[PDB]
Each structure stands twice: as C-alpha cells, then as structure tokens.
C-alpha cells in the first residue's frame, strides 16, 4: 500500500498595491507622520 503524498502545491499570494490599482486616480495619497497629531484638515477656498 501507499498514500502518495504528491507535491504540496503552495499557491503563492497575488500582490496588490494601492497606487497600482485604478482607485488611486481618484485618490491622492499623502504620507504625513503627524496625522496622529492633527485635529483635522480643513481647506479654505476663496471664490470670487
């Protein structure tokens, strides 16, 4: 008798990246290491 443990076929994970994805054309990703220190971000606009 035999069991024939054949090749364990370790399926490698498919990688992603945020900027490589198509949502980053709507995003605008900015590192800011005191985001843990902001209250918020509150862009003022002047419209004539």
């Amino acid at each position: 008798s035999f069991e024939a443990i054949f090749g364990t076929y370790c399926n490698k994970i498919e990688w992603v990246t945020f900027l490589g994805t198509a949502l980053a054309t709507a995003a605008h990703a900015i590192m800011f290491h005191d985001l843990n220190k902001m209250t918020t971000g509150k862009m003022l606009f002047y419209i004539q």
């Binding site: 800011f32 290491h33 005191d34 220190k37």
Partner: protein, 49 residues
C-alpha cells in the same frame, strides 16, 4: 519624525535632565538644611553658655 516629534522628545530629555539637575540641587540644599538643623539641635544659647 516630521520634526514635531523632535521638540517633544528633546523636551522629554530636557525635563528628565532638569529633574535630575534640580534633584541634585535639592539634595545639596537638604544637606545644608539638616546640617543646620543638627547644629541648631546641638547648639545651646549664649545665656546658657
């Protein structure tokens, strides 16, 4: 560090160093204090002496 951490860290350093520095000051002044108080507790007045 996007530089706002750096003042906070060096002020932590300054606070610890000033704590130890004024601590050595307090140790010296407490030595002055208890030395003076021992001389007071071992010094009789002039109308006794």
């Amino acid at each position: 560090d996007t530089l706002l951490d750096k003042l906070l860290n060096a002020d932590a350093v300054n606070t610890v160093l000033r704590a130890v520095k004024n601590t050595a000051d307090a140790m010296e002044r407490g030595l002055i204090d208890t030395f003076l108080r021992v001389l007071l507790r071992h010094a009789p007045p002039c109308f006794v002496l």
